[PDB]
């Protein structure tokens, strides 16, 4: 309803994103939407628009995580370098917790993911885990085991540190220090 040409912009980005990238959108907006959206992910953005929570800046952030600087130029005419300085302020439409996990996974390469699994075996004890699963999948995997919680990570920093990824560890610290969001019912 409300027609608006904003629907067209939303539709176009869905087609451009790969099935792998499309998963990230659900993950990032997972907190915002309890998967209330029908099976089609196209409707995911549609329901967000209705809530009025869909900001263009958010779309820029969403496209950036999936490493789609190319689409930024075509859809929002946003410079790739502009995103780097813009995100410097580290603004988040939704809790940084969900974005933090997606962003970190993006930084890690395929080899890094495999190495991370071995570290997880010691704590996980060899649970339902495989190299096939992506970094994003690993994040939700830990949720079942309740080894990682929004207000308590600890384990995440240790494993990443082993991979000699100080930058990732630093980003996590920002999140922990960003717990004073003063958000409550």
């Amino acid at each position: 309803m409300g027609r608006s040409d904003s629907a067209e912009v939303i539709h176009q980005v869905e087609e451009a994103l790969d099935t792998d990238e499309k998963e990230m959108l659900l993950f990032l907006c997972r907190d915002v939407a309890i998967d209330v959206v029908p099976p089609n992910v196209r409707d995911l953005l549609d329901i967000l628009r209705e809530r009025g929570k869909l900001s263009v800046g958010d779309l820029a952030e969403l496209l950036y995580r999936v490493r789609r600087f190319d689409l930024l130029k075509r859809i929002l005419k946003m410079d790739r370098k502009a995103v780097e300085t813009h995100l410097l302020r580290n603004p988040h439409l939704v809790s940084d917790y969900r974005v933090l996990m997606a962003e970190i996974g993006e930084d890690l390469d395929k080899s890094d993911v495999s190495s991370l699994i071995g570290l997880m075996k010691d704590y996980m004890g060899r649970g339902k885990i495989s190299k096939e699963k992506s970094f994003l999948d690993l994040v939700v995997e830990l949720e079942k085991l309740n080894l990682v919680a929004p207000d308590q990570l600890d384990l995440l920093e240790k494993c990443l540190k082993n991979i000699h990824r100080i930058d990732l560890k630093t980003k996590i610290q920002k999140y922990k220090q960003l717990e004073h969001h003063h958000h409550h019912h």
Partner: peptide, 8 residues
């Protein structure tokens, strides 16, 4: 940004 986001 925010100035390069308004693009919609």
């Amino acid at each position: 940004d925010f100035s390069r986001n308004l693009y919609d």
